Amino acid sequence: MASYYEILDVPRSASADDIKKAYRRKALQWHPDKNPDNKEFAEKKFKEVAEAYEVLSDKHKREIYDRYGRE
């Protein structure tokens, strides 16, 4: 169970570098300069990519997500 394919931007296969870059690319993708009348979705995506990239990039955070998901 990685779920990264679903959560971020690309499948789990790309190195951690790409994970951070996928966050950045999506950040620009939903950045206010690139967003129309829908700001909620853009910020929502920015917020979820930030947290999701955060947990996957940090090995300790990943397990916290799993343990405190169940808890």
Q: Which of 71, 52, 50 is nearest to 62 (CA)?
A: 52
Most distant pair of Cα atoms in the chain: their distance: 39
Contact 22, 9 (CB under 8 A): yes
Could you tell me the residue range of the domain that residue 11 belongs to?
1-71
**Which of 64, 63, 57 is closest to 23 using CA atoms?**
57
Q: Which residue do the tokens 């998901």 mark?
A: 69
Tell me what percent of the chain is helix, strand and coil, each rounded to the nearest 5. Answer: 70, 0, 30
CA 27, CA 66: separation in Å to the nearest integer?
25
CATH of the domain at 25: 1.10.287.110
Cβ 48 vs Cβ 29: under 8 Å: no
Domain count, the chain: 1
Q: How far apart are CA 38 and CA 20, in angstroms?
A: 24
